[PDB]
Design a protein around this ligand. Structure first.
Ligand SMILES: CC[C@@H](N)C(=O)N1CCC[C@H]1C(=O)NCc1cccc(Cl)c1
Ligand code: NA
Ligand code: NA
Lengths: 28, 251, 10
């Protein structure tokens, strides 16, 4: 839908899961 | 998943479990793309070489899960299938080209901390993120190794692999509707999807709007976590036309 | 090996 891709327990609360930064750092 | 890790609670709220009624069992992974639609791989439902041709009544959809075998009371939600939709040009005969299907649910699922849909890519997100070396995340409750069953949802991050490398790794005829992912023997780290992970989501988190997109569907591999071999994924943006066709015409 | 789902949902 339009709230898509935003997880309640992480993005909605501005928390990160433990390895999403591995993803970010690869987006080089 | 092979050489993956235990998922954090709420980490993959789109993750769906294709569940077999009788005998009760895990059929495949799948994903939640809206409150009534679930996306999965075609071969999870139809694969004549293995005498697989499931119908709605055969299956249940279990959303919001963490634990593989446990019935997570007050947390998970199990949905009944209304209709199954398989890509009309799904190639089970040669290479599993277009390995994708839609599953319309009987009643809307209610979102929660544990249940939430993932986005589907637009052309500009696909173009920006489908790049060799960019990593995605695949999840599922499948085997822990080629030759076992995890207690909870497993997670692994894997780099998208260069098309020539994909092609040179296999004898199978590969298409634009596919991409492969996994580390090279070189890169040391490892990990892959495995049996039972089928139809599950390959997602990326856009650095542009911080939203998670499902770029791929777990489709096939030759072994699991085999050195010099890669996981192959249905290219979801390449079949997005088909997806909104199906959704634009059946409610 | 799977915990029994409620008889409903079928
Ligand atoms: C056609 C190659 C065959 N080994 C295969 O992978 N099949 C035959 C039809 C089902 C599919 C499968 O096992 N998919 C699961 C899978 C295993 C390992 C990696 C990945 Cl990405 C997916
Ligand atoms: Na080849
Ligand atoms: Na490999």
């Amino acid at each position: 839908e339009a709230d898509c891709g935003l997880r309640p327990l992480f993005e909605k609360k501005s928390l990160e899961d433990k390895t999403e930064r591995e993803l970010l750092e690869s987006y080089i | 998943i092979v050489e993956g890790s235990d998922a954090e609670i709420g980490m993959s709220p789109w993750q769906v479990m294709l569940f077999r009624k009788s005998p009760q069992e895990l059929l495949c992974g799948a994903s939640l793309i809206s409150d009534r639609w679930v996306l999965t791989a075609a071969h999870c439902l139809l694969y004549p070489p293995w005498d697989k041709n499931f119908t709605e009544n055969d299956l249940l959809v279990r959303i919001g899960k963490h634990s593989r075998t446990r019935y997570e009371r007050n947390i998970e939600k199990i949905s009944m299938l209304e209709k199954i939709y398989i890509h009309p040009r799904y190639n089970w005969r040669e290479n599993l080209d277009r390995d994708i299907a839609l599953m319309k649910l009987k009643k809307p699922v209610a979102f929660s901390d544990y249940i939430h849909p993932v986005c589907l890519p637009d052309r500009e997100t696909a173009a920006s993120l489908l790049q060799a070396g960019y990593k995605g995340r695949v999840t599922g409750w499948g085997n822990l190794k080629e030759t076992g069953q995890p207690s909870v949802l497993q997670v692994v991050n894997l780099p998208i692999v260069e098309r020539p490398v994909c092609k040179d790794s296999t004898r199978i005829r590969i298409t634009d509707n596919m991409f492969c992912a996994g580390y090279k023997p070189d890169e040391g780290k490892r990990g892959d999807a495995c049996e039972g992970d089928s139809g599950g989501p390959f997602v990326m988190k856009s650095p542009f709007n911080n939203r998670w997109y499902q770029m791929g569907i777990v489709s096939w591999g030759e072994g699991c976590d085999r050195d010099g071999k890669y996981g192959f994924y249905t290219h979801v943006f390449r079949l997005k036309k088909w997806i909104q066709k199906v959704i634009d015409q059946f409610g | 090996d799977f915990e029994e789902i409620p008889e409903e949902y079928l």
